[PDB]
Coordinates of N, CA and C in Angstrom, one line a residue:
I139 N 0.8 -1.2 0.0 CA 0.0 0.0 0.0 C 0.9 1.3 0.0
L140 N 0.6 2.2 -0.9 CA 1.3 3.5 -1.0 C 0.7 4.4 0.1
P141 N 1.5 5.2 0.8 CA 1.0 6.0 1.9 C -0.2 6.9 1.5
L142 N -1.1 7.0 2.4 CA -2.3 7.9 2.1 C -2.0 9.3 2.7
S143 N -2.2 10.3 1.8 CA -2.0 11.7 2.3 C -3.1 12.0 3.3
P144 N -3.0 13.2 4.0 CA -4.0 13.6 4.9 C -5.4 13.9 4.2
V145 N -5.3 14.5 3.1 CA -6.6 14.9 2.4 C -7.3 13.6 1.9
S146 N -6.5 12.6 1.4 CA -7.1 11.4 0.9 C -7.7 10.6 2.1
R147 N -6.9 10.5 3.2 CA -7.4 9.8 4.4 C -8.7 10.4 4.9
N148 N -8.8 11.7 5.0 CA -10.0 12.4 5.3 C -11.1 12.1 4.3
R149 N -10.8 12.1 3.0 CA -11.8 11.8 2.0 C -12.4 10.5 2.2
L150 N -11.6 9.5 2.6 CA -12.1 8.1 2.7 C -13.2 8.0 3.7
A151 N -13.2 8.8 4.8 CA -14.2 8.8 5.8 C -15.5 9.5 5.4
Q152 N -15.5 10.2 4.3 CA -16.7 10.9 3.9 C -17.5 10.2 2.8
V153 N -17.0 9.1 2.4 CA -17.7 8.3 1.3 C -18.0 6.9 1.9
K154 N -19.0 6.3 1.3 CA -19.5 5.0 1.8 C -18.5 3.8 1.5
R155 N -18.6 2.8 2.3 CA -17.9 1.6 2.0 C -18.4 0.9 0.8
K156 N -17.5 0.3 0.0 CA -17.8 -0.3 -1.3 C -17.5 -1.8 -1.3
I157 N -18.2 -2.4 -2.3 CA -18.1 -3.9 -2.5 C -17.5 -4.1 -3.8
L158 N -16.6 -5.1 -3.9 CA -15.9 -5.5 -5.1 C -16.3 -6.9 -5.4
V159 N -17.2 -7.1 -6.5 CA -17.6 -8.4 -6.9 C -16.6 -9.0 -7.8
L160 N -16.3 -10.3 -7.5 CA -15.2 -11.0 -8.3 C -15.8 -12.2 -9.0
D161 N -15.6 -12.4 -10.3 CA -15.8 -13.6 -10.9 C -14.7 -14.6 -10.7
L162 N -14.9 -15.9 -11.0 CA -13.8 -16.9 -10.8 C -13.3 -17.3 -12.2
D163 N -14.0 -18.1 -12.9 CA -13.5 -18.8 -14.1 C -13.1 -17.7 -15.1
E164 N -11.8 -17.8 -15.6 CA -11.1 -17.0 -16.6 C -11.0 -15.5 -16.1
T165 N -11.3 -15.2 -14.8 CA -11.0 -13.9 -14.2 C -9.9 -14.1 -13.2
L166 N -10.0 -15.0 -12.2 CA -9.0 -15.2 -11.2 C -8.3 -16.6 -11.4
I167 N -9.0 -17.5 -12.0 CA -8.5 -18.9 -12.2 C -8.9 -19.4 -13.5
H168 N -8.3 -20.5 -13.9 CA -8.8 -21.3 -15.1 C -8.6 -22.8 -14.7
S169 N -9.6 -23.6 -14.9 CA -9.6 -25.0 -14.6 C -10.0 -25.8 -15.8
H170 N -9.5 -27.1 -15.8 CA -9.9 -28.1 -16.8 C -10.0 -29.4 -16.2
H171 N -11.0 -30.2 -16.6 CA -11.3 -31.5 -16.0 C -10.7 -32.6 -16.8
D172 N -11.0 -33.8 -16.3 CA -10.4 -35.0 -16.9 C -10.8 -35.2 -18.4
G173 N -9.8 -35.0 -19.3 CA -10.1 -35.1 -20.7 C -9.4 -34.0 -21.5
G174 N 3.1 -28.1 -20.7 CA 2.3 -28.6 -19.6 C 2.6 -28.1 -18.2
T175 N 1.9 -27.1 -17.8 CA 2.1 -26.5 -16.5 C 1.4 -27.3 -15.4
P176 N 2.1 -27.6 -14.3 CA 1.4 -28.3 -13.2 C 0.4 -27.4 -12.5
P177 N -0.8 -27.9 -12.1 CA -1.8 -27.1 -11.5 C -1.5 -26.6 -10.2
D178 N -2.1 -25.5 -9.7 CA -1.9 -25.0 -8.4 C -2.6 -25.9 -7.4
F179 N -3.8 -26.4 -7.6 CA -4.5 -27.4 -6.8 C -5.4 -28.2 -7.6
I180 N -5.8 -29.3 -7.1 CA -6.7 -30.2 -7.8 C -8.0 -30.4 -6.9
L181 N -9.1 -30.1 -7.5 CA -10.4 -30.2 -6.8 C -11.1 -31.5 -7.2
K182 N -11.6 -32.2 -6.2 CA -12.4 -33.4 -6.3 C -13.8 -33.1 -5.8
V183 N -14.8 -33.0 -6.7 CA -16.2 -32.7 -6.3 C -17.1 -33.7 -6.9
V184 N -18.1 -34.1 -6.2 CA -19.1 -35.0 -6.7 C -20.3 -34.2 -7.3
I185 N -20.6 -34.5 -8.6 CA -21.6 -33.8 -9.4 C -22.5 -34.8 -10.0
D186 N -23.7 -34.9 -9.6 CA -24.7 -35.9 -10.1 C -24.2 -37.3 -9.8
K187 N -23.7 -37.5 -8.6 CA -23.3 -38.8 -8.2 C -22.1 -39.3 -9.1
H188 N -21.2 -38.4 -9.5 CA -20.1 -38.7 -10.3 C -18.9 -37.9 -9.8
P189 N -17.8 -38.6 -9.3 CA -16.6 -38.0 -8.9 C -15.9 -37.3 -10.1
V190 N -15.6 -36.0 -10.0 CA -15.0 -35.3 -11.1 C -13.8 -34.5 -10.5
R191 N -12.7 -34.5 -11.2 CA -11.5 -33.9 -10.8 C -11.2 -32.7 -11.7
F192 N -10.9 -31.5 -11.1 CA -10.6 -30.3 -11.8 C -9.2 -29.9 -11.5
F193 N -8.4 -29.6 -12.5 CA -7.0 -29.1 -12.4 C -7.1 -27.5 -12.5
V194 N -6.9 -26.9 -11.4 CA -7.1 -25.4 -11.3 C -5.8 -24.7 -11.3
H195 N -5.7 -23.7 -12.2 CA -4.6 -22.8 -12.3 C -5.0 -21.4 -11.9
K196 N -4.1 -20.8 -11.0 CA -4.4 -19.4 -10.6 C -3.8 -18.4 -11.6
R197 N -4.6 -17.4 -11.9 CA -4.0 -16.3 -12.6 C -2.8 -15.7 -11.9
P198 N -1.8 -15.3 -12.6 CA -0.6 -14.7 -12.0 C -1.0 -13.5 -11.0
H199 N -0.4 -13.6 -9.8 CA -0.5 -12.5 -8.8 C -1.9 -12.4 -8.2
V200 N -2.7 -13.5 -8.3 CA -4.1 -13.4 -7.7 C -4.0 -13.3 -6.2
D201 N -3.1 -14.1 -5.5 CA -3.0 -14.0 -4.1 C -2.7 -12.6 -3.6
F202 N -1.6 -12.0 -4.2 CA -1.3 -10.7 -3.8 C -2.4 -9.7 -4.1
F203 N -3.1 -9.9 -5.3 CA -4.2 -9.1 -5.6 C -5.3 -9.1 -4.6
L204 N -5.6 -10.3 -4.1 CA -6.7 -10.5 -3.2 C -6.3 -9.9 -1.8
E205 N -5.0 -10.1 -1.4 CA -4.6 -9.5 -0.2 C -4.7 -8.0 -0.2
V206 N -4.4 -7.4 -1.3 CA -4.4 -5.9 -1.4 C -5.8 -5.4 -1.4
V207 N -6.6 -5.8 -2.4 CA -8.0 -5.2 -2.5 C -8.9 -5.5 -1.4
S208 N -8.6 -6.6 -0.6 CA -9.4 -6.9 0.6 C -9.3 -5.8 1.6
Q209 N -8.2 -5.0 1.6 CA -8.1 -3.9 2.5 C -8.9 -2.7 2.1
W210 N -9.4 -2.7 0.8 CA -10.0 -1.5 0.2 C -11.5 -1.7 0.1
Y211 N -12.0 -3.0 -0.1 CA -13.3 -3.3 -0.5 C -13.8 -4.5 0.3
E212 N -15.1 -4.7 0.4 CA -15.7 -5.9 0.8 C -15.8 -6.8 -0.4
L213 N -15.1 -8.0 -0.4 CA -15.1 -8.8 -1.5 C -16.3 -9.8 -1.6
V214 N -16.8 -10.0 -2.7 CA -17.9 -10.9 -2.9 C -17.7 -11.7 -4.2
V215 N -17.8 -13.1 -4.1 CA -17.7 -13.9 -5.2 C -19.1 -14.1 -5.9
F216 N -19.2 -13.8 -7.2 CA -20.4 -14.0 -7.9 C -20.0 -14.8 -9.1
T217 N -20.2 -16.1 -9.1 CA -19.8 -17.0 -10.1 C -21.1 -17.7 -10.8
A218 N -20.9 -18.0 -12.1 CA -22.0 -18.7 -12.8 C -21.8 -20.2 -12.7
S219 N -20.8 -20.7 -11.9 CA -20.6 -22.1 -11.7 C -21.6 -22.7 -10.7
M220 N -21.8 -24.0 -10.8 CA -22.5 -24.6 -9.7 C -21.9 -24.5 -8.4
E221 N -22.7 -24.4 -7.3 CA -22.1 -24.1 -6.0 C -21.1 -25.1 -5.5
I222 N -21.2 -26.4 -5.9 CA -20.3 -27.4 -5.4 C -18.9 -27.1 -5.9
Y223 N -18.8 -26.6 -7.2 CA -17.5 -26.2 -7.7 C -17.1 -24.8 -7.3
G224 N -17.9 -23.8 -7.4 CA -17.6 -22.5 -7.0 C -17.2 -22.3 -5.6
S225 N -17.9 -23.0 -4.7 CA -17.6 -22.9 -3.3 C -16.2 -23.6 -3.0
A226 N -15.9 -24.7 -3.6 CA -14.6 -25.4 -3.3 C -13.5 -24.5 -3.9
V227 N -13.7 -23.9 -5.0 CA -12.6 -23.0 -5.6 C -12.4 -21.8 -4.7
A228 N -13.5 -21.1 -4.3 CA -13.3 -20.0 -3.4 C -12.6 -20.3 -2.1
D229 N -12.9 -21.5 -1.5 CA -12.3 -21.9 -0.3 C -10.7 -22.0 -0.5
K230 N -10.3 -22.6 -1.6 CA -8.9 -22.7 -1.8 C -8.2 -21.4 -2.1
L231 N -8.9 -20.5 -2.8 CA -8.4 -19.2 -3.1 C -8.3 -18.4 -1.8
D232 N -9.3 -18.5 -0.9 CA -9.2 -17.8 0.4 C -8.0 -18.3 1.2
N233 N -7.8 -19.6 1.2 CA -6.7 -20.2 2.0 C -6.7 -19.7 3.4
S234 N -7.8 -19.8 4.1 CA -8.0 -19.4 5.5 C -7.8 -18.0 5.8
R235 N -7.8 -17.1 4.8 CA -7.7 -15.7 5.1 C -9.0 -15.0 5.4
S236 N -10.1 -15.7 5.2 CA -11.4 -15.1 5.6 C -11.8 -13.8 4.9
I237 N -11.4 -13.7 3.6 CA -11.8 -12.6 2.8 C -12.7 -12.9 1.6
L238 N -13.0 -14.2 1.3 CA -13.8 -14.6 0.2 C -15.0 -15.4 0.7
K239 N -15.5 -15.1 1.9 CA -16.5 -15.9 2.5 C -17.9 -15.7 1.9
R240 N -18.1 -14.5 1.3 CA -19.4 -14.2 0.7 C -19.5 -14.6 -0.7
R241 N -20.4 -15.5 -1.1 CA -20.4 -16.1 -2.4 C -21.9 -16.1 -3.0
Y242 N -22.0 -16.0 -4.3 CA -23.2 -16.2 -5.0 C -22.9 -17.1 -6.2
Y243 N -23.8 -18.0 -6.6 CA -23.5 -19.0 -7.6 C -24.5 -19.0 -8.7
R244 N -24.6 -20.1 -9.5 CA -25.5 -20.1 -10.6 C -26.9 -19.8 -10.3
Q245 N -27.4 -20.3 -9.2 CA -28.8 -20.2 -8.8 C -29.2 -18.7 -8.6
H246 N -28.2 -17.8 -8.5 CA -28.5 -16.4 -8.4 C -28.3 -15.7 -9.7
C247 N -28.0 -16.4 -10.8 CA -27.9 -15.8 -12.1 C -29.1 -16.1 -12.9
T248 N -29.3 -15.4 -14.0 CA -30.4 -15.6 -15.0 C -29.7 -15.7 -16.4
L249 N -30.1 -16.8 -17.1 CA -29.5 -17.1 -18.4 C -30.3 -16.4 -19.5
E250 N -29.6 -15.6 -20.3 CA -30.2 -14.8 -21.3 C -29.3 -14.8 -22.5
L251 N -29.7 -15.3 -23.7 CA -28.9 -15.4 -24.9 C -27.6 -16.1 -24.7
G252 N -27.7 -17.2 -23.9 CA -26.5 -18.0 -23.6 C -25.5 -17.4 -22.6
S253 N -25.9 -16.3 -22.0 CA -25.0 -15.6 -21.0 C -25.7 -15.6 -19.6
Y254 N -24.9 -15.9 -18.6 CA -25.4 -15.9 -17.2 C -25.2 -14.4 -16.7
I255 N -26.3 -13.7 -16.6 CA -26.3 -12.3 -16.1 C -26.3 -12.4 -14.6
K256 N -25.5 -11.5 -14.0 CA -25.3 -11.4 -12.5 C -25.9 -10.1 -12.1
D257 N -27.1 -10.2 -11.4 CA -27.8 -9.0 -11.0 C -27.1 -8.5 -9.7
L258 N -26.4 -7.3 -9.8 CA -25.7 -6.8 -8.7 C -26.6 -6.5 -7.5
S259 N -27.8 -6.2 -7.8 CA -28.8 -5.8 -6.7 C -29.0 -7.0 -5.7
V260 N -28.7 -8.2 -6.2 CA -28.7 -9.4 -5.3 C -27.7 -9.2 -4.2
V261 N -26.5 -8.6 -4.5 CA -25.4 -8.4 -3.6 C -25.7 -7.1 -2.8
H262 N -26.0 -6.0 -3.5 CA -26.1 -4.7 -2.9 C -26.9 -3.8 -3.8
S263 N -28.0 -3.2 -3.4 CA -28.9 -2.5 -4.2 C -28.4 -1.0 -4.3
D264 N -27.5 -0.5 -3.5 CA -27.0 0.8 -3.6 C -25.9 0.8 -4.7
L265 N -26.3 1.1 -5.9 CA -25.4 1.0 -7.1 C -24.3 2.0 -7.1
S266 N -24.2 3.0 -6.1 CA -23.1 3.9 -6.0 C -21.9 3.2 -5.4
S267 N -22.0 2.1 -4.8 CA -21.0 1.5 -3.9 C -20.7 0.0 -4.2
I268 N -20.9 -0.4 -5.4 CA -20.6 -1.8 -5.8 C -20.0 -1.8 -7.2
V269 N -19.0 -2.6 -7.3 CA -18.2 -2.8 -8.5 C -18.1 -4.2 -8.8
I270 N -18.0 -4.6 -10.1 CA -17.9 -6.0 -10.5 C -16.7 -6.1 -11.5
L271 N -15.8 -7.1 -11.2 CA -14.7 -7.4 -12.1 C -15.0 -8.8 -12.7
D272 N -15.2 -8.8 -14.0 CA -15.7 -10.0 -14.7 C -15.1 -10.0 -16.1
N273 N -14.7 -11.2 -16.6 CA -14.1 -11.4 -17.9 C -15.3 -11.5 -18.9
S274 N -16.5 -11.8 -18.5 CA -17.6 -12.0 -19.4 C -18.4 -10.8 -19.5
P275 N -18.4 -10.0 -20.6 CA -19.3 -8.8 -20.7 C -20.7 -9.1 -20.5
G276 N -21.2 -10.2 -20.8 CA -22.6 -10.5 -20.6 C -23.0 -10.6 -19.1
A277 N -22.0 -10.9 -18.3 CA -22.3 -11.0 -16.8 C -22.9 -9.7 -16.2
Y278 N -22.4 -8.6 -16.7 CA -22.9 -7.3 -16.2 C -23.7 -6.5 -17.3
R279 N -24.5 -7.3 -18.1 CA -25.3 -6.7 -19.1 C -26.3 -5.7 -18.5
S280 N -26.7 -5.9 -17.3 CA -27.7 -5.0 -16.6 C -27.1 -3.9 -15.8
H281 N -25.8 -4.0 -15.6 CA -25.1 -3.0 -14.7 C -23.8 -2.6 -15.4
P282 N -23.8 -2.1 -16.6 CA -22.5 -1.7 -17.3 C -21.8 -0.6 -16.6
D283 N -22.5 0.3 -15.9 CA -21.9 1.5 -15.3 C -21.2 1.1 -14.0
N284 N -21.2 -0.2 -13.6 CA -20.6 -0.7 -12.4 C -19.5 -1.7 -12.7
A285 N -19.1 -1.9 -13.9 CA -18.3 -3.0 -14.4 C -16.8 -2.5 -14.7
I286 N -15.9 -3.4 -14.3 CA -14.5 -3.2 -14.8 C -14.2 -4.4 -15.7
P287 N -14.0 -4.2 -17.0 CA -13.7 -5.4 -17.8 C -12.3 -5.8 -17.6
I288 N -12.0 -7.1 -17.9 CA -10.7 -7.7 -17.8 C -10.6 -8.8 -18.8
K289 N -9.4 -8.9 -19.4 CA -9.1 -9.9 -20.4 C -9.3 -11.3 -19.8
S290 N -9.9 -12.2 -20.6 CA -10.0 -13.6 -20.1 C -8.7 -14.2 -20.0
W291 N -8.5 -15.1 -19.0 CA -7.2 -15.7 -18.7 C -7.4 -17.2 -18.8
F292 N -6.5 -17.9 -19.6 CA -6.5 -19.3 -19.7 C -5.2 -19.9 -19.2
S293 N -4.0 -19.4 -19.6 CA -2.8 -20.0 -19.2 C -1.6 -19.0 -19.4
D294 N -1.7 -17.9 -19.9 CA -0.6 -17.0 -20.2 C 0.2 -16.6 -19.0
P295 N 1.4 -17.2 -18.8 CA 2.1 -16.9 -17.6 C 2.6 -15.5 -17.4
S296 N 2.7 -14.7 -18.5 CA 3.1 -13.3 -18.4 C 2.0 -12.3 -18.1
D297 N 0.8 -12.8 -17.8 CA -0.3 -11.9 -17.5 C -0.1 -11.1 -16.2
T298 N -0.3 -9.8 -16.3 CA -0.2 -8.9 -15.2 C -1.5 -8.1 -15.0
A299 N -2.6 -8.5 -15.6 CA -3.8 -7.7 -15.6 C -4.3 -7.4 -14.2
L300 N -4.1 -8.3 -13.2 CA -4.5 -8.0 -11.8 C -3.7 -7.0 -11.2
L301 N -2.4 -7.0 -11.5 CA -1.5 -5.9 -10.9 C -1.8 -4.6 -11.5
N302 N -2.1 -4.6 -12.8 CA -2.4 -3.3 -13.5 C -3.6 -2.6 -13.0
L303 N -4.5 -3.4 -12.4 CA -5.8 -2.8 -11.9 C -5.7 -2.2 -10.5
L304 N -4.6 -2.4 -9.8 CA -4.5 -2.0 -8.4 C -4.6 -0.5 -8.2
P305 N -3.8 0.2 -9.0 CA -3.9 1.7 -8.8 C -5.3 2.3 -9.1
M306 N -5.9 1.8 -10.1 CA -7.3 2.3 -10.4 C -8.2 1.9 -9.2
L307 N -8.2 0.6 -8.8 CA -9.1 0.2 -7.7 C -8.8 1.0 -6.4
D308 N -7.5 1.3 -6.2 CA -7.1 2.2 -5.1 C -7.8 3.5 -5.2
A309 N -7.7 4.2 -6.3 CA -8.2 5.5 -6.5 C -9.7 5.5 -6.5
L310 N -10.3 4.4 -7.1 CA -11.8 4.4 -7.2 C -12.5 4.5 -5.9
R311 N -11.8 4.0 -4.8 CA -12.6 3.9 -3.5 C -12.7 5.3 -2.9
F312 N -12.1 6.3 -3.4 CA -12.2 7.7 -2.9 C -13.4 8.4 -3.5
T313 N -14.1 7.8 -4.5 CA -15.2 8.4 -5.1 C -16.4 8.2 -4.2
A314 N -17.4 9.1 -4.2 CA -18.7 8.9 -3.6 C -19.6 8.0 -4.4
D315 N -19.5 7.9 -5.7 CA -20.2 7.1 -6.6 C -19.3 6.5 -7.6
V316 N -19.1 5.2 -7.5 CA -18.2 4.5 -8.4 C -18.5 4.8 -9.9
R317 N -19.8 4.9 -10.2 CA -20.3 5.1 -11.5 C -19.7 6.4 -12.1
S318 N -19.3 7.4 -11.3 CA -18.7 8.6 -11.8 C -17.5 8.3 -12.7
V319 N -16.8 7.2 -12.3 CA -15.6 6.8 -13.1 C -16.0 5.7 -14.1
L320 N -16.7 4.7 -13.7 CA -16.9 3.5 -14.5 C -17.9 3.8 -15.6
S321 N -18.8 4.8 -15.5 CA -19.7 5.1 -16.5 C -19.0 5.7 -17.7
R322 N -17.9 6.4 -17.5 CA -17.1 7.0 -18.6 C -16.6 5.9 -19.5
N323 N -15.9 4.9 -18.9 CA -15.4 3.7 -19.6 C -16.4 3.0 -20.4
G324 N -22.6 13.5 -27.7 CA -21.8 13.5 -26.4 C -20.4 12.9 -26.6
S325 N -20.3 11.8 -27.4 CA -19.0 11.3 -27.8 C -18.3 12.3 -28.6
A326 N -19.0 13.2 -29.3 CA -18.4 14.2 -30.1 C -17.8 15.3 -29.2
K327 N -18.4 15.5 -28.0 CA -17.9 16.5 -27.1 C -16.6 16.0 -26.3
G328 N -16.0 17.0 -25.6 CA -14.8 16.7 -24.9 C -15.1 16.7 -23.4
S329 N -16.3 16.5 -23.0 CA -16.7 16.5 -21.6 C -16.2 15.3 -20.9
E330 N -15.6 15.5 -19.7 CA -15.2 14.3 -18.8 C -16.3 14.1 -17.7
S331 N -17.1 15.1 -17.4 CA -18.1 15.0 -16.4 C -19.4 15.6 -16.9
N332 N -20.5 15.2 -16.3 CA -21.8 15.8 -16.7 C -22.5 16.4 -15.5
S333 N -21.9 16.5 -14.3 CA -22.5 17.2 -13.2 C -21.3 17.6 -12.2
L334 N -21.6 18.5 -11.3 CA -20.7 18.9 -10.3 C -20.4 17.8 -9.4
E335 N -21.3 16.9 -9.1 CA -21.1 15.8 -8.3 C -20.1 14.8 -8.9
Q336 N -20.3 14.5 -10.2 CA -19.3 13.6 -10.9 C -18.0 14.3 -11.0
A337 N -17.9 15.6 -11.2 CA -16.7 16.3 -11.3 C -15.9 16.2 -10.0
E338 N -16.6 16.3 -8.9 CA -15.9 16.1 -7.6 C -15.4 14.7 -7.4
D339 N -16.1 13.7 -7.9 CA -15.6 12.3 -7.8 C -14.4 12.1 -8.7
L340 N -14.3 12.7 -9.8 CA -13.1 12.6 -10.7 C -11.9 13.3 -10.1
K341 N -12.2 14.5 -9.4 CA -11.1 15.1 -8.7 C -10.5 14.3 -7.6
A342 N -11.3 13.7 -6.8 CA -10.8 12.8 -5.8 C -10.1 11.5 -6.4
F343 N -10.7 11.0 -7.5 CA -10.1 9.9 -8.2 C -8.7 10.3 -8.7
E344 N -8.6 11.4 -9.3 CA -7.3 11.8 -9.8 C -6.3 12.2 -8.7
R345 N -6.8 12.7 -7.6 CA -5.9 13.1 -6.5 C -5.1 11.8 -6.0
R346 N -5.8 10.7 -5.9 CA -5.1 9.5 -5.5 C -4.1 9.0 -6.6
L347 N -4.5 9.1 -7.8 CA -3.5 8.7 -8.9 C -2.3 9.6 -8.8
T348 N -2.5 10.9 -8.6 CA -1.4 11.9 -8.4 C -0.4 11.4 -7.4
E349 N -0.9 10.8 -6.3 CA 0.0 10.2 -5.3 C 0.8 9.1 -5.8
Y350 N 0.2 8.3 -6.7 CA 1.0 7.2 -7.3 C 2.0 7.8 -8.3
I351 N 1.6 8.7 -9.1 CA 2.6 9.2 -10.2 C 3.8 9.8 -9.5
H352 N 3.7 10.5 -8.4 CA 4.8 11.2 -7.8 C 5.7 10.2 -6.9
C353 N 5.2 8.9 -6.8 CA 6.0 7.9 -6.2 C 6.7 7.0 -7.3
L354 N 6.1 7.0 -8.5 CA 6.6 6.2 -9.6 C 7.5 7.0 -10.6
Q355 N 7.0 8.2 -11.1 CA 7.7 9.0 -12.0 C 9.1 9.3 -11.5
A356 N 9.2 9.5 -10.2 CA 10.5 9.8 -9.5 C 11.2 8.5 -9.1

């Protein structure tokens, strides 16, 4: 963690606590079942009275990623997997750290056009204070203003997508409404904000990035 200035620390107390929703498959891990890098762990789950073995690979730097963002957000797992698989994966990723205990699985999704949509209001209905990180754009079809896209991960060992997100996720938590930033991510205009409230959120967002730049540029 990069040191927090006095203005940023004061800012944090004036905005609400936020939730970071995390997908599993192809976001934080990739698994393949019965049918060459050694796996990180092997899951044995019974599915329809059938023992099945999954070889699970962790995306590079996931453990560090989880350790860091858990200090900034309440973490929630929202997976389209069946609970027997998603729960076992989340347990191994948690590894007794007690940061991934809140989970939602397939039964909380709705299948539309072949995509499992994840209704964020199931987790938290205050849409100013919830963010979702998901490799599947269909997962946040109903909450695009709350979504952080990420490249799907299968095996690329040089992937650093989780590290690259940490400065943004750091600065994002100083906003009063996360949508002030994520809604940006009229097109003819050069406007960055559409209200004084959003403008204030972007100033706080950039103030934290400024603290990063002056530790890195130098």
